[PDB]
Amino acid sequence: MILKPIGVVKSPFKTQNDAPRQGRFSDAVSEIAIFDEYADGLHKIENLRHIIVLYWMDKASRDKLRVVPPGETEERGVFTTRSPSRPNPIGLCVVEILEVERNRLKVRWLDALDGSPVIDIKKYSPEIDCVNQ
Amino acid sequence: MILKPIGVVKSPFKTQNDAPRQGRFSDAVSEIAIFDEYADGLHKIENLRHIIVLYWMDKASRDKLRVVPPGETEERGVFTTRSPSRPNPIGLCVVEILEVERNRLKVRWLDALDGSPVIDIKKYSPEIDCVNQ
Ligand SMILES: C[S@@+](CC[C@H](N)C(=O)[O-])C[C@H]1O[C@@H](n2cnc3c(N)ncnc32)[C@H](O)[C@@H]1O
Ligand SMILES: C[S@@+](CC[C@H](N)C(=O)[O-])C[C@H]1O[C@@H](n2cnc3c(N)ncnc32)[C@H](O)[C@@H]1O
Numbered sequence: 307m308i309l310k311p312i313g314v315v316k317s318p319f320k321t322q323n324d325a326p327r328q329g330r331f332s333d334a335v336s337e338i339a340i341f342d343e344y345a346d347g348l349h350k351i352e353n354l355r356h357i358i359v360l361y362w363m364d365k366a367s368r369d370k371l372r373v374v375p376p377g378e379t380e381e382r383g384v385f386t387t388r389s390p391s392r393p394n395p396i397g398l399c400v401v402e403i404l405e406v407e408r409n410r411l412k413v414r415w416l417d418a419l420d421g422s423p424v425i426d427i428k429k430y431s432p433e434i435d436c437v438n439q
Numbered sequence: 440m441i442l443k444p445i446g447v448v449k450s451p452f453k454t455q456n457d458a459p460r461q462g463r464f465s466d467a468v469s470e471i472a473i474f475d476e477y478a479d480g481l482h483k484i485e486n487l488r489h490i491i492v493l494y495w496m497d498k499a500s501r502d503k504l505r506v507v508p509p510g511e512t513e514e515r516g517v518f519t520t521r522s523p524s525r526p527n528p529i530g531l532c533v534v535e536i537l538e539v540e541r542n543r544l545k546v547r548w549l550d551a552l553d554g555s556p557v558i559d560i561k562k563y564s565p566e567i568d569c570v571n572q
Contacts, residue, residue: 307442307495307556312526330567340518344526347504349516356570357518360493360529362440371479383482385473385490385560388567393443393477394559396493396529400568423440426527427518434463434521436569437489437533 312347313340313409313424315361320420322365327376328388329399329417336401336416338424345409347427352406356430359399359416362423366395397422400430445480446473446542446557448494453553455498460509461521462532462550469534469549471557473542480560485539489563492549495556496528530555533563 317336319325326332338359340348351357370391372381384392397418405412450469452458459465471492473481484490503524505514517525530551538545 307444307497307558309440309442309527310501311440328567344504347516347518347525349505349514349519351516351519353515354519358531360527360531364440368443371477372482381482383480383484385480386482386484386487386562388561388564392480392559393445394493396559398491398493398531398561400570402570425440426525426529428521428531429519430570431521432570432572434461435533437535437563437565439489439565 309425311423312344313338315418315420315422315424317416317418317420322419325417325419329415332417333414335404335412335414336418338411338413340409340424342409348409354403354429356400356402358428358430359401359424360426361397361418362425363390363395363397364422365419366390368393368395396425400435442495442558444556445477446471448549448551448553448555448557450549450551450553458552459550462548465550466547468537468545468547469551471544471546475542478542481542487536487562489533489535491561491563492532492534492557493559494530494551495558496523496530497555499523499528501526501528529558533568
């Protein structure tokens with residue numbers, strides 16, 4: 307299983323120390339530049355307000371299985387958290403499209419470090435992404 | 440980027456012909472067996488009711504950029520859908536944990552074909568995975 311990057315992220319977060327814990331609590335604007343060879347996968351995306359972005363957290367550790375979430379004292383499995391470190395550092399964010407510039411998207415709520423590779427983008431859908439509780 | 444398979448899915452969905460398009464609409468129970476090597480990642484997962492599962496749709500086409508959803512006539516980009524076919528066929532599911540054995544989890548709302556590779560697991564979080572509109 308080999309992932310082929312379909313784009314790259316451009317944001318104001320250069321290092322792990324600059325990006326927000328969770329993009330939903332930040333007003334920072336990020337850019338998703340999809341590669342020309344995949345650009346055609348954006349057809350009619352301007353009809354969407356919210357999308358799901360999967361990116362690769364390249365500087366994250368891939369052999370860490372236990373972590374202490376911020377504010378916590380004891381460790382827990384990474385699969386029970388949103389920590390960047392995990393066997394497959396896939397960053398998952400629900401973002402809001404603010405603009406569509408050809409093969410580039412201006413969005414907010416994305417918390418990827420500048421330069422992070424983009425893996426996939428899907429339609430955000432309340433009925434399947436949200437749990438009524 | 441290369442993905443490490445952290446587990447395998449066991450489900451009653453053999454092929455795309457008997458699999459729910461969206462697992463949230465099915466009541467079928469699926470099992471996620473994580474390889475011992477990553478077992479530590481499940482530490483304290485029994486304390487959760489909902490988690491997000493990322494799996495690899497290994498029999499899906501990776502060279503389609505457009506598709507026509509079931510209840511649709513016009514085609515749109517795969518990045519505006521939840522369709523299997525896309526550059527990186529990663530299935531995304533919010534699931535409900537019914538049971539936790541040792542390295543195995545029985546959940547519902549998963550729509551992975553039987554034997555599909557598991558890629559990642561994250562805690563489900565309303566405030567970030569769901570948009571309040
Ligand atoms: C908690 S993660 C977001 C995880 C996402 N909500 C998810 O569910 O997968 C955001 C943090 O990961 C770090 N991060 C973002 N992009 C990264 C990258 N390309 N490599 C390493 N770390 C990254 C940032 O420092 C940021 O504070
Ligand atoms: C629409 S996809 C699920 C997408 C997921 N809910 C998401 O948000 O990314 C589910 C469909 O893809 C197909 N599918 C599931 N697992 C697969 C696999 N391992 N290989 C190929 N196709 C698969 C099944 O036929 C099923 O009806």
